[PDB]
Design a protein around this nucleic acid. Structure first.
Length: 50
DNA sequence: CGTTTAAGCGGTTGCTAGAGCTGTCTACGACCAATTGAGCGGCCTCGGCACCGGGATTCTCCAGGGCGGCCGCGAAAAGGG
């Protein structure tokens, strides 16, 4: 969730390199993957269409 | 003061309620004219309460009739010269 408080807590960190460990990248909709790749690549990926 | 527990915070996941906006239309209420009947005042009359005259009803008082007690009075029986 992009609006969850952990997203703004972690996205404001001054970090050069990030990495996400999970087992289920897609759960409900493409917006979850869009939020994950925006946390990874800020502004490079522009997934908007459902 | 020791211990447990539930509030607080963050999180999911979908649907529904509700605010906001735009659009249409239709029944509903404002408005006006003519009308009239329900509200306010007075006027008249009866129901009931009350006042006055007349008649029927019961209680109190004054007088007559009869009986008891006194007032010496008077005829009569017994005693004395």
């Amino acid at each position: 969730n992009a609006e969850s408080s952990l997203y703004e807590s972690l996205n404001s960190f001054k970090v050069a390199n990030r990495m996400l460990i999970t087992g289920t990248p897609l759960q409900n909709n493409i917006k979850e993957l869009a939020a994950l790749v925006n946390f990874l690549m800020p502004g490079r990926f522009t997934i908007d269409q459902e």
